[PDB]
Amino acid sequence: ASLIYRQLLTNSYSVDLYDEIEQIGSGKTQNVTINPGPFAQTRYAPVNWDHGEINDS
Amino acid sequence: ASLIYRQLLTNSYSVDLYDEIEQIGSGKTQNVTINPGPFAQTRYAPVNWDHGEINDS
């Protein structure tokens, strides 16, 4: 019964087929690789509030 | 070391099996779902240009 190990080693190539099968079976996702470089947050502006355009006559 | 030639000839049926693997795994539906990243998009707005306020009387 020693030939079990010999047979498994010799026939091990079929695991490539098994890998292809499980690859086809598995669902897939992916990445949108993130950007670095938010090193400078930006404020709005120097903003001053005032009454609008008065309509004089 | 001659055993490799025998193994290749004997196991050649796995070639046709592998052809089936690939040419039906292609047939099976796959969808790699590329994401939107953690950072979220957004457009300005629906913006339409018009003449401003008119001072009628």
JSON list of C-alpha atoms in Angstrom, two decimals:
[
{"chain": "A", "resi": 1, "resn": "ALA", "atom": "CA", "xyz": [0.00, 0.00, 0.00]},
{"chain": "A", "resi": 2, "resn": "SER", "atom": "CA", "xyz": [3.02, 2.30, -0.16]},
{"chain": "A", "resi": 3, "resn": "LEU", "atom": "CA", "xyz": [1.95, 3.40, -3.64]},
{"chain": "A", "resi": 4, "resn": "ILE", "atom": "CA", "xyz": [-0.64, 5.85, -2.27]},
{"chain": "A", "resi": 5, "resn": "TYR", "atom": "CA", "xyz": [2.03, 8.48, -1.72]},
{"chain": "A", "resi": 6, "resn": "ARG", "atom": "CA", "xyz": [3.76, 7.77, -5.03]},
{"chain": "A", "resi": 7, "resn": "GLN", "atom": "CA", "xyz": [0.42, 8.04, -6.81]},
{"chain": "A", "resi": 8, "resn": "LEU", "atom": "CA", "xyz": [-0.52, 11.31, -5.12]},
{"chain": "A", "resi": 9, "resn": "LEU", "atom": "CA", "xyz": [2.84, 12.87, -5.96]},
{"chain": "A", "resi": 10, "resn": "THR", "atom": "CA", "xyz": [2.76, 11.62, -9.56]},
{"chain": "A", "resi": 11, "resn": "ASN", "atom": "CA", "xyz": [-0.85, 12.67, -10.20]},
{"chain": "A", "resi": 12, "resn": "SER", "atom": "CA", "xyz": [-0.51, 16.01, -8.35]},
{"chain": "A", "resi": 13, "resn": "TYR", "atom": "CA", "xyz": [-0.77, 17.86, -11.69]},
{"chain": "A", "resi": 14, "resn": "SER", "atom": "CA", "xyz": [-4.59, 17.58, -11.55]},
{"chain": "A", "resi": 15, "resn": "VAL", "atom": "CA", "xyz": [-4.66, 20.20, -8.80]},
{"chain": "A", "resi": 16, "resn": "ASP", "atom": "CA", "xyz": [-4.08, 22.74, -11.56]},
{"chain": "A", "resi": 17, "resn": "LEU", "atom": "CA", "xyz": [-7.42, 21.68, -13.04]},
{"chain": "A", "resi": 18, "resn": "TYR", "atom": "CA", "xyz": [-8.95, 21.86, -9.57]},
{"chain": "A", "resi": 19, "resn": "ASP", "atom": "CA", "xyz": [-7.57, 25.38, -9.14]},
{"chain": "A", "resi": 20, "resn": "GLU", "atom": "CA", "xyz": [-9.10, 26.40, -12.45]},
{"chain": "A", "resi": 21, "resn": "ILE", "atom": "CA", "xyz": [-12.45, 24.96, -11.35]},
{"chain": "A", "resi": 22, "resn": "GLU", "atom": "CA", "xyz": [-12.51, 26.77, -8.02]},
{"chain": "A", "resi": 23, "resn": "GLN", "atom": "CA", "xyz": [-11.39, 29.97, -9.76]},
{"chain": "A", "resi": 24, "resn": "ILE", "atom": "CA", "xyz": [-14.34, 29.70, -12.15]},
{"chain": "A", "resi": 25, "resn": "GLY", "atom": "CA", "xyz": [-16.63, 28.99, -9.21]},
{"chain": "A", "resi": 26, "resn": "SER", "atom": "CA", "xyz": [-15.51, 31.88, -7.02]},
{"chain": "A", "resi": 27, "resn": "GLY", "atom": "CA", "xyz": [-17.01, 35.31, -7.35]},
{"chain": "A", "resi": 28, "resn": "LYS", "atom": "CA", "xyz": [-14.60, 38.18, -7.92]},
{"chain": "A", "resi": 29, "resn": "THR", "atom": "CA", "xyz": [-14.08, 41.76, -6.77]},
{"chain": "A", "resi": 30, "resn": "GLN", "atom": "CA", "xyz": [-11.34, 44.35, -7.33]},
{"chain": "A", "resi": 31, "resn": "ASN", "atom": "CA", "xyz": [-9.93, 47.67, -6.11]},
{"chain": "A", "resi": 32, "resn": "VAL", "atom": "CA", "xyz": [-10.01, 51.26, -7.36]},
{"chain": "A", "resi": 33, "resn": "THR", "atom": "CA", "xyz": [-6.70, 51.98, -5.69]},
{"chain": "A", "resi": 34, "resn": "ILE", "atom": "CA", "xyz": [-7.02, 54.92, -3.32]},
{"chain": "A", "resi": 35, "resn": "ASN", "atom": "CA", "xyz": [-5.23, 58.24, -3.85]},
{"chain": "A", "resi": 36, "resn": "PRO", "atom": "CA", "xyz": [-2.80, 59.63, -1.27]},
{"chain": "A", "resi": 37, "resn": "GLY", "atom": "CA", "xyz": [-2.16, 63.35, -1.10]},
{"chain": "A", "resi": 38, "resn": "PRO", "atom": "CA", "xyz": [-4.96, 65.01, 0.90]},
{"chain": "A", "resi": 39, "resn": "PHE", "atom": "CA", "xyz": [-2.10, 66.74, 2.72]},
{"chain": "A", "resi": 40, "resn": "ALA", "atom": "CA", "xyz": [-3.75, 70.19, 2.35]},
{"chain": "A", "resi": 41, "resn": "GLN", "atom": "CA", "xyz": [-7.35, 70.65, 3.40]},
{"chain": "A", "resi": 42, "resn": "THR", "atom": "CA", "xyz": [-8.72, 73.86, 1.88]},
{"chain": "A", "resi": 43, "resn": "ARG", "atom": "CA", "xyz": [-11.00, 76.39, 3.58]},
{"chain": "A", "resi": 44, "resn": "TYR", "atom": "CA", "xyz": [-13.73, 78.25, 1.70]},
{"chain": "A", "resi": 45, "resn": "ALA", "atom": "CA", "xyz": [-12.46, 81.82, 1.36]},
{"chain": "A", "resi": 46, "resn": "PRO", "atom": "CA", "xyz": [-12.38, 85.07, 3.32]},
{"chain": "A", "resi": 47, "resn": "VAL", "atom": "CA", "xyz": [-16.14, 85.63, 3.35]},
{"chain": "A", "resi": 48, "resn": "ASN", "atom": "CA", "xyz": [-17.90, 88.74, 4.66]},
{"chain": "A", "resi": 49, "resn": "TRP", "atom": "CA", "xyz": [-21.67, 89.05, 4.96]},
{"chain": "A", "resi": 50, "resn": "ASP", "atom": "CA", "xyz": [-23.55, 92.16, 3.84]},
{"chain": "A", "resi": 51, "resn": "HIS", "atom": "CA", "xyz": [-26.94, 93.35, 2.70]},
{"chain": "A", "resi": 52, "resn": "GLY", "atom": "CA", "xyz": [-27.62, 92.79, -0.98]},
{"chain": "A", "resi": 53, "resn": "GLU", "atom": "CA", "xyz": [-28.07, 95.34, -3.77]},
{"chain": "A", "resi": 54, "resn": "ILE", "atom": "CA", "xyz": [-30.48, 97.99, -2.51]},
{"chain": "A", "resi": 55, "resn": "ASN", "atom": "CA", "xyz": [-32.63, 99.33, -5.35]},
{"chain": "A", "resi": 56, "resn": "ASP", "atom": "CA", "xyz": [-32.42, 103.07, -4.81]},
{"chain": "A", "resi": 57, "resn": "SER", "atom": "CA", "xyz": [-34.01, 105.81, -6.91]},
{"chain": "B", "resi": 1, "resn": "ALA", "atom": "CA", "xyz": [13.46, 9.23, -15.35]},
{"chain": "B", "resi": 2, "resn": "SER", "atom": "CA", "xyz": [11.94, 7.68, -18.46]},
{"chain": "B", "resi": 3, "resn": "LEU", "atom": "CA", "xyz": [8.71, 7.50, -16.45]},
{"chain": "B", "resi": 4, "resn": "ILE", "atom": "CA", "xyz": [7.90, 11.12, -17.34]},
{"chain": "B", "resi": 5, "resn": "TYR", "atom": "CA", "xyz": [7.34, 10.22, -21.00]},
{"chain": "B", "resi": 6, "resn": "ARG", "atom": "CA", "xyz": [5.03, 7.38, -20.01]},
{"chain": "B", "resi": 7, "resn": "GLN", "atom": "CA", "xyz": [3.13, 9.62, -17.61]},
{"chain": "B", "resi": 8, "resn": "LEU", "atom": "CA", "xyz": [2.66, 12.32, -20.26]},
{"chain": "B", "resi": 9, "resn": "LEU", "atom": "CA", "xyz": [1.38, 9.87, -22.87]},
{"chain": "B", "resi": 10, "resn": "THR", "atom": "CA", "xyz": [-0.87, 8.08, -20.37]},
{"chain": "B", "resi": 11, "resn": "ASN", "atom": "CA", "xyz": [-2.33, 11.28, -18.89]},
{"chain": "B", "resi": 12, "resn": "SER", "atom": "CA", "xyz": [-2.86, 13.07, -22.23]},
{"chain": "B", "resi": 13, "resn": "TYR", "atom": "CA", "xyz": [-6.63, 12.71, -21.65]},
{"chain": "B", "resi": 14, "resn": "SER", "atom": "CA", "xyz": [-6.31, 15.46, -19.06]},
{"chain": "B", "resi": 15, "resn": "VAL", "atom": "CA", "xyz": [-5.50, 17.76, -21.99]},
{"chain": "B", "resi": 16, "resn": "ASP", "atom": "CA", "xyz": [-9.01, 17.35, -23.39]},
{"chain": "B", "resi": 17, "resn": "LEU", "atom": "CA", "xyz": [-10.38, 17.62, -19.87]},
{"chain": "B", "resi": 18, "resn": "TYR", "atom": "CA", "xyz": [-8.52, 20.93, -19.45]},
{"chain": "B", "resi": 19, "resn": "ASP", "atom": "CA", "xyz": [-9.85, 22.14, -22.79]},
{"chain": "B", "resi": 20, "resn": "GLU", "atom": "CA", "xyz": [-13.32, 21.49, -21.39]},
{"chain": "B", "resi": 21, "resn": "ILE", "atom": "CA", "xyz": [-12.32, 23.32, -18.18]},
{"chain": "B", "resi": 22, "resn": "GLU", "atom": "CA", "xyz": [-11.38, 26.53, -19.94]},
{"chain": "B", "resi": 23, "resn": "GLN", "atom": "CA", "xyz": [-13.94, 26.49, -22.77]},
{"chain": "B", "resi": 24, "resn": "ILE", "atom": "CA", "xyz": [-16.85, 26.05, -20.35]},
{"chain": "B", "resi": 25, "resn": "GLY", "atom": "CA", "xyz": [-15.46, 28.27, -17.60]},
{"chain": "B", "resi": 26, "resn": "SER", "atom": "CA", "xyz": [-15.50, 31.01, -20.21]},
{"chain": "B", "resi": 27, "resn": "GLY", "atom": "CA", "xyz": [-19.12, 30.08, -20.90]},
{"chain": "B", "resi": 28, "resn": "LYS", "atom": "CA", "xyz": [-20.00, 30.34, -17.22]},
{"chain": "B", "resi": 29, "resn": "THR", "atom": "CA", "xyz": [-20.88, 33.88, -16.14]},
{"chain": "B", "resi": 30, "resn": "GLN", "atom": "CA", "xyz": [-18.27, 35.89, -14.23]},
{"chain": "B", "resi": 31, "resn": "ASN", "atom": "CA", "xyz": [-18.40, 39.53, -13.11]},
{"chain": "B", "resi": 32, "resn": "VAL", "atom": "CA", "xyz": [-15.41, 41.23, -11.51]},
{"chain": "B", "resi": 33, "resn": "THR", "atom": "CA", "xyz": [-17.13, 44.04, -9.61]},
{"chain": "B", "resi": 34, "resn": "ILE", "atom": "CA", "xyz": [-14.66, 46.89, -9.61]},
{"chain": "B", "resi": 35, "resn": "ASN", "atom": "CA", "xyz": [-15.73, 49.19, -6.82]},
{"chain": "B", "resi": 36, "resn": "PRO", "atom": "CA", "xyz": [-16.09, 52.82, -6.30]},
{"chain": "B", "resi": 37, "resn": "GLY", "atom": "CA", "xyz": [-13.32, 53.48, -3.79]},
{"chain": "B", "resi": 38, "resn": "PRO", "atom": "CA", "xyz": [-13.88, 54.56, -0.19]},
{"chain": "B", "resi": 39, "resn": "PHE", "atom": "CA", "xyz": [-13.83, 58.16, -1.44]},
{"chain": "B", "resi": 40, "resn": "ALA", "atom": "CA", "xyz": [-17.22, 59.02, -2.97]},
{"chain": "B", "resi": 41, "resn": "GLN", "atom": "CA", "xyz": [-17.90, 60.98, -6.16]},
{"chain": "B", "resi": 42, "resn": "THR", "atom": "CA", "xyz": [-20.43, 63.75, -6.71]},
{"chain": "B", "resi": 43, "resn": "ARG", "atom": "CA", "xyz": [-21.17, 66.14, -9.56]},
{"chain": "B", "resi": 44, "resn": "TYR", "atom": "CA", "xyz": [-21.91, 69.85, -9.07]},
{"chain": "B", "resi": 45, "resn": "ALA", "atom": "CA", "xyz": [-25.66, 70.05, -9.71]},
{"chain": "B", "resi": 46, "resn": "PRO", "atom": "CA", "xyz": [-28.05, 70.45, -12.61]},
{"chain": "B", "resi": 47, "resn": "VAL", "atom": "CA", "xyz": [-27.01, 74.04, -13.38]},
{"chain": "B", "resi": 48, "resn": "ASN", "atom": "CA", "xyz": [-28.73, 76.15, -16.03]},
{"chain": "B", "resi": 49, "resn": "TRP", "atom": "CA", "xyz": [-27.69, 79.65, -17.08]},
{"chain": "B", "resi": 50, "resn": "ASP", "atom": "CA", "xyz": [-30.19, 82.50, -17.27]},
{"chain": "B", "resi": 51, "resn": "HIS", "atom": "CA", "xyz": [-30.37, 86.27, -17.18]},
{"chain": "B", "resi": 52, "resn": "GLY", "atom": "CA", "xyz": [-30.34, 87.62, -13.65]},
{"chain": "B", "resi": 53, "resn": "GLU", "atom": "CA", "xyz": [-32.94, 89.67, -11.83]},
{"chain": "B", "resi": 54, "resn": "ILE", "atom": "CA", "xyz": [-34.29, 92.63, -13.81]},
{"chain": "B", "resi": 55, "resn": "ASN", "atom": "CA", "xyz": [-35.37, 95.84, -12.08]},
{"chain": "B", "resi": 56, "resn": "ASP", "atom": "CA", "xyz": [-38.77, 96.39, -13.68]},
{"chain": "B", "resi": 57, "resn": "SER", "atom": "CA", "xyz": [-41.30, 99.10, -12.87]}
]
